[PDB]
From Swiss-Prot, chain B:
Impact when changing R7T: In strain: Omicron/BQ.1.1, Omicron/XBB.1.5, Omicron/EG.5.1
Record annotation: effect of changing S34P: In strain: Omicron/BA.1, Omicron/BA.2, Omicron/BA.2.12.1, Omicron/BA.2.75, Omicron/BA.4, Omicron/BA.5, Omicron/BQ.1.1, Omicron/XBB.1.5, Omicron/EG.5.1
Stated name of the protein: Spike protein S1
Effect of N4Q: Reduced viral infectivity
Subunit structure: Binds to host ACE2. RBD also interacts with the N-linked glycan on 'Asn-90' of ACE2. Cleavage of S generates a polybasic C-terminal sequence on S1 that binds to host Neuropilin-1 (NRP1) and Neuropilin-2 (NRP2) receptors. Interacts with host integrin alpha-5/beta-1 (ITGA5:ITGB1) and with ACE2 in complex with integrin alpha-5/beta-1 (ITGA5:ITGB1). May interact via cytoplasmic c-terminus with M protein. May interact (via N-terminus) with host bilirubin and biliverdin, thereby preventing antibody binding to the SARS-CoV-2 spike NTD via an allosteric mechanism.
Result, substituting S32F: In strain: Omicron/BA.2, Omicron/BA.2.12.1, Omicron/BA.2.75, Omicron/BA.4, Omicron/BA.5, Omicron/BQ.1.1, Omicron/XBB.1.5, Omicron/EG.5.1
Gene: S
Its job: Attaches the virion to the cell membrane by interacting with host receptor, initiating the infection. The major receptor is host ACE2. When S2/S2' has been cleaved, binding to the receptor triggers direct fusion at the cell membrane. When S2/S2' has not been cleaved, binding to the receptor results in internalization of the virus by endocytosis using host TFRC and GRM2 and leading to fusion of the virion membrane with the host endosomal membrane. Alternatively, may use NRP1/NRP2 and integrin as entry receptors.
Outcome recorded upon mutating L29I: In strain: Omicron/XBB.1.5, Omicron/EG.5.1
Full-sequence portion shown in this chain: 340 to 388 of 1273
Organism: Severe acute respiratory syndrome coronavirus 2 (2019-nCoV)
Length: 48, 49, 49
């Protein structure tokens, strides 16, 4: 999702918090968007 | 042999040496007052160890 | 230590979980394995292979 790596542990063990915050935020945005998409699809399928 | 050396090559012919199969202690380099510039990109200076 | 939920740092690969004897066999060039969803699932011991 634009971050340096897709693994949170690598980001945590490689960078200090002030600079790793941006990467964590990008990962959070991407994963939250994916989860919301999944939940909406599940709601529609559940209605069907 | 690289940090504490006598000859440093020219800028356009910068000398590259490969480091492998050893244990590196970057804390002694970072905490030393001999260096007037120590900045890391893609990693923090305290996490190399 | 096996059969206990522990934090592990295998050759720089950090994580948390339970380490156990593996029935899988690794070819003598592979270091770690991944699932169908690419989640890390196995690791080769740097000191015991
Ligand atoms: C040293 O490494 C060798 C080769 O992998 C291994 O057989 C041996 O058990 C190791 N020794 C110790 C003390 O870890």
């Amino acid at each position: 999702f634009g971050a340096i790596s897709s693994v949170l542990n690598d980001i945590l063990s490689r960078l200090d918090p002030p600079e790793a915050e941006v990467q964590i935020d990008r990962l959070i945005t991407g994963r939250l968007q994916s989860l919301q998409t999944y939940v909406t699809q599940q709601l529609i399928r559940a209605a069907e | 042999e690289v940090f504490n050396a006598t000859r440093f090559a020219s800028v356009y012919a910068w000398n590259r040496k490969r480091i492998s199969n050893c244990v590196a202690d970057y804390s002694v380099l970072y905490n030393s007052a001999s260096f007037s510039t120590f900045k890391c990109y893609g990693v923090s200076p305290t996490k190399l160890n | 230590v096996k059969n206990k939920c522990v934090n592990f740092n295998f050759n720089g690969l950090t994580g948390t979980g339970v380490l156990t004897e593996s029935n899988k066999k690794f070819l003598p060039f592979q270091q770690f394995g991944r699932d169908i969803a690419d989640t890390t699932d196995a690791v080769r011991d740097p000191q015991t292979l």
